[PDB]
Design a protein around this nucleic acid. Structure first.
Lengths: 65, 100, 58, 93
RNA sequence: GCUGUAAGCAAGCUUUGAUCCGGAGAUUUCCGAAUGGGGAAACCCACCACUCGUAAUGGAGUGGUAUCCAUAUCUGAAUUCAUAGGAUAUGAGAAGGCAGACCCGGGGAACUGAAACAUCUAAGUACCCGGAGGAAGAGAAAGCAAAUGCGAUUCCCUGAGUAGCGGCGAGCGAAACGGGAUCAGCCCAAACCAAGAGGCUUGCCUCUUGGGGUUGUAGGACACUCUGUACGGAGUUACAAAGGAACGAGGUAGAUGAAGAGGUCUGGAAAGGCCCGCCAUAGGAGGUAACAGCCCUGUAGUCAAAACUUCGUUCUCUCCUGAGUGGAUCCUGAGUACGGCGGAACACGUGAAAUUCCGUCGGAAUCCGGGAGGACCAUCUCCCAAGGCUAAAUACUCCCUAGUGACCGAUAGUGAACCAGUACCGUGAGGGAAAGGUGAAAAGCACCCCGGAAGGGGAGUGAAAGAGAUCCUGAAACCGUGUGCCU
RNA sequence: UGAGUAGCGAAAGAGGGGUGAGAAUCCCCUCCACCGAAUGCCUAAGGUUUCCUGAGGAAGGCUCGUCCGCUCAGGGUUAGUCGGGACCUAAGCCGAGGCCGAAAGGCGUAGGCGAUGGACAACAGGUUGAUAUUCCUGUACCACCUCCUCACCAUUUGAGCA
């Protein structure tokens, strides 16, 4: 997934994905309080997909230094 | 060392000499399922699901070092070698040099 | 109490009695509280009287 | 950070949630270290339905047991939050 | 193939190479030296900049904000200069920890012995406190030693329980010579000279920088003859510091890897008996349904690391003269060495007591000098204290790999083979347990009968079910039930 | 072993019905009885879920036990005005600098902590199987700030903050 993401820019993508990966995550913790969208391993996509994108950012601070 | 699913003899045990393929492997416990070998009757609770319960006719799996592959040609119980150009360590079966 | 120009201290030893027993005594070194030039300016540190009887400026 | 989204976690569906949700007040857990006015940041900016009040309890954990092995529940901090009149609701539906 | 314990269910992920294992990072809420401040550890409250948002207050994120010290810079009191002090920035400074050890230094007992006990011993032991380093300390002579002398310290063995010390009693007890392990020596200070500054009555003499200068039958200065500024030597561990970059070999992951299902028998199972074949630089071990060289993981041999390291060699880089001759004179370690008084360490307990080190008084020579040669003096032999650096030989382990036990086999071995410093016990410092094994695998007993349900009896499961949840073996005390003979 | 022995922890229950396999000990009703300056309520010190519901019942209950403060499975505590911190201080404690002392530290200035004190704005009802001067229904009150409206000043010969 990294090569799909370093070609993505900082501004126009980490905005629109991570906040919408939150919109995938946080809409799903609500359903985990209910159980209607069962699909339980869709979480471990989403939170783990956050965790790789957020260390590209902190990498680029070293790359900006 | 054996994978699912190569052709498999049974070295020793109660089923000494039957053959079959591999339904599943369990590599952390070093133990492999074979069809129809160590066929064991098991009593089961009535499930949820199925409601039948009854007796099942599964196989408890077999330790790995009571299992050999075969030459495709001779059909012999043979030990394993390796080293194959453009084959990513594909098994040289002894009585050289058949793959897989 | 440990002075400045040298390293005079309290080196505690024994008071050997007559018909020795013998108990313990602190021996703090001699001191007078006098002016001594340091980084600007003096005053003040304890001095040792061996270092004050002819030495740096009082 | 601190975003509106990570502040909330879930709604809490009890027998209390039956009667309160019909009276324009809703139950939510909040994180352990997030105050009352951070809750008004959520519902305004997540749900778009304006907060009347925020009321925040917190619970200690029941020290449960399994076998020999005894241990304590994680601590919970809920929030009954009221909304305005003429404003909808964006629950499970 | 994977979603750890965990034995099941859902949801999923993977040879567009997943699960795993290593290297290098990033992430790393809060407390804790805690360091903005308060604090009753896991929490509250601030302020300064910047951001988000509301009309604003309120609210939220991002860093900074201690203390000491040092480098500077502004200020700069009574008090005039000026200082104390105050403000500011810079410091990949340092406070904390822990390998419960080993090594220095400061403090430092008692109990025990001496058959009592107070001199002594125990013992400079334990304990407390400051130091750090992987080692530390010591060290190139004011050394031993008395000849044809040895040449820095350290460690080991002798020397030897000898010389000795001791109410000479208990007990303490060295050194030097001999033989090894390891093996390297050098800079400062002082005169002399150069450059600054800084005063004095020009003169004169007083601090730093840079050379020079490292000593003992004396060396240096100074002067006079040489000799170089290299291609010779050194070098980051002392010797002065300090940089890189290449070649090889280990380490943190590996990969290859020989030979048989030999047949038959016993069996639940061969790995076992018998009759047999092979491999072997591999017959180390550990699994394998039971005791395998040949079934497996491996073993013996070989070979590999993108990245981190640790080591050895080179290159780069950096740095550098050594001697003779004399002595007109100037240096060679000052409130220091020694000496009195009082103590301690030396094996030496204040002694015929050398020696070292402290407190306090005194207090010299400085080469025609001076110190050691167990009080002291002359002669004679060594040797220059009053400055500093010094790897290795050594002692050590909480540790990390690989390994070995005439070590233990669960009342043993660590307290802990078991979710152990847990449970409990204590206000608290602290004390501190017990607890291993179904089976080869759950095949962990479907179904029927009794019973509310545990708990059984049949049925199947497996070799065993008397093996079925303290679950292999099951002894004895005990508790039963039947009894043959006696009451 | 003692030994089916001592003990079963002051203190009135009784009767009908119900639950369940089983009832004196569980529930309900009805009579009776005890405390009533406490055995009443409210809320500290502490305790950390013992609270409520729904099931069980082996174990703890000094006996049973359908029951429990036991076991499970869920549920349960809403504050600008109440106690405490965005206020202050007492004895005491800590303490920059400072002073003494082999070390470690002892004390202590300026400072700061530290209620049991001083200051301090909300009340009367309802409400559930569980929370209340919190939820809610009516009034209020407290401080701060202004996208607004008006009233009154003054323009440093100065309103006001003070």
């Amino acid at each position: 997934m990294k090569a799909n993401e370093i070609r993505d820019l900082t501004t126009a993508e980490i905005e629109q994905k991570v906040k919408s990966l939150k919109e995938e995550l946080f809409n799903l913790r609500f359903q985990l309080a209910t159980g209607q969208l069962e699909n339980t391993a869709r979480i471990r996509e989403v939170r783990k997909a956050i965790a790789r994108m957020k260390t590209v950012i902190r990498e680029r601070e070293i790359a900006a230094n | 060392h054996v994978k699912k699913g190569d052709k498999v003899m049974v070295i020793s045990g109660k089923d000494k000499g039957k053959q079959g393929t591999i339904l599943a492997a369990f590599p952390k416990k070093d133990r492999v399922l074979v069809e129809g070998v160590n066929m064991v009757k098991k009593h089961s609770k009535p499930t949820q699901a199925n409601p039948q319960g009854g007796i099942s006719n599964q196989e408890a799996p077999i330790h790995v070092s009571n299992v050999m592959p075969l030459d495709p040609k001779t059909g012999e119980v043979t030990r394993v070698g390796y080293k194959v150009e453009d084959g990513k360590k594909v098994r040289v079966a002894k009585k050289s040099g058949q793959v897989l | 109490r440990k002075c400045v120009i040298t390293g005079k201290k309290t080196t505690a030893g024994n008071n050997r009695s007559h018909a020795m027993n013998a108990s313990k005594r602190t021996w703090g070194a001699n001191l007078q509280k006098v002016r001594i030039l340091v980084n600007g300016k003096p005053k003040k540190v304890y001095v040792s009287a061996r270092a004050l009887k002819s030495g740096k400026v009082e | 950070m601190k975003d509106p989204r990570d502040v909330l976690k879930r709604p809490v569906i009890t027998e209390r949630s039956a009667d309160l949700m019909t009276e324009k007040k809703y139950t939510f857990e909040v994180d352990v270290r997030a105050n009352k006015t951070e809750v008004k940041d959520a519902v305004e900016s997540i749900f778009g339905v304006k907060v009347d009040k925020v009321n925040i309890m917190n619970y200690k954990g029941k020290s449960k047991r399994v076998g020999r092995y005894t241990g304590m529940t994680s601590r919970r901090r809920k929030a009954i939050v009221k909304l305005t009149a003429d404003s909808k609701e964006i629950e499970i539906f």
